[PDB]
């Protein structure tokens, strides 16, 4: 199912964003963000992302980091670009 592929990609993207925000306390992040842009444009609100909460805690059981982390995919990718430039 292609929608299950989309939701698994977004879940993995959110988990990996949490782990990258954890890893960087401040070059591989820049190459990771572009790695999640060729994917996104190959595929091509705030409430849209809350439905992913439970499936993200399945693999990353951290309420604090998920709360700190917070069309909608372009907003998150712009946030990732802004974090990579800094």
């Amino acid at each position, epitope marked *: 199912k292609f929608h299950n592929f989309f939701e698994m990609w977004v879940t993995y993207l959110l988990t990996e964003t949490i782990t990258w925000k954890d890893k960087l306390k401040t070059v591989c992040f820049d190459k990771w963000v572009k790695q999640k842009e060729d994917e996104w444009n190959s595929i091509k609100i705030n409430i849209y992302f*809350e*439905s992913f909460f*439970f499936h993200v805690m399945k693999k990353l059981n951290k*309420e604090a980091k998920w709360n700190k982390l*917070m069309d909608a995919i372009e907003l998150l990718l712009e946030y990732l670009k802004e974090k990579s430039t800094i």
Partner: antibody
Amino acid sequence: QVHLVQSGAEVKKPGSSATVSCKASGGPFRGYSVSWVRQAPGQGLEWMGQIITMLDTITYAQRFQDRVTIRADETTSTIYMELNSLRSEDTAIYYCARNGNATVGSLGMDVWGRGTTVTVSS
Amino acid sequence: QAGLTQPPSESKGLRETATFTCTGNSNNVGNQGAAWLQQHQGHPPKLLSYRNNNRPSGISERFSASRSGNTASLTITGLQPEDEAVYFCSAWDTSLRAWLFGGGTHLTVLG
């Protein structure tokens, strides 16, 4: 505002199979993570299993690994139950409840069902 | 033991604060937290505290929860004589992948 309404109680016999179904509404069906809780009369709750309705991921309890099965039906937005081996002391009121509030970002059994009190007897 | 151990019952008077305890291990309660549940006689258990100890909608500010590290606590200040309910602590075990419920203290007001 997610609402959970619980099916009526059913009287079973030992060795039969029970089916507890509660439908959930109030948002997208993708973002539902309801769990099934057993409370025998006279003592406390006992978590049986849960389903996260996004990628069809069910986690069972250790003692209900080979007994209970949980599935979801996205057309009617219902969550099903099944107990293959019903035994005499498996008498309880069965609840379904999501395990968190996604708007707040926290895990907790927030909204609960009415309760399907399956009573096995002879 | 690896579950959630809770005292069987606690009894406090009216207009008094009630102190709770629910101790697990580094996986059940110490890891992220524990949720507190209010169950009356023959009623579905209403939640009072999330794992981060937030107040859900429909619950007043009279309740309050916290965690002293590897032990969850829930405080009820000024017991109301119609607060006869059994209170449960739940906590997602990360080693067994299970919500673990405690025994559940029974609250009896004195009046």
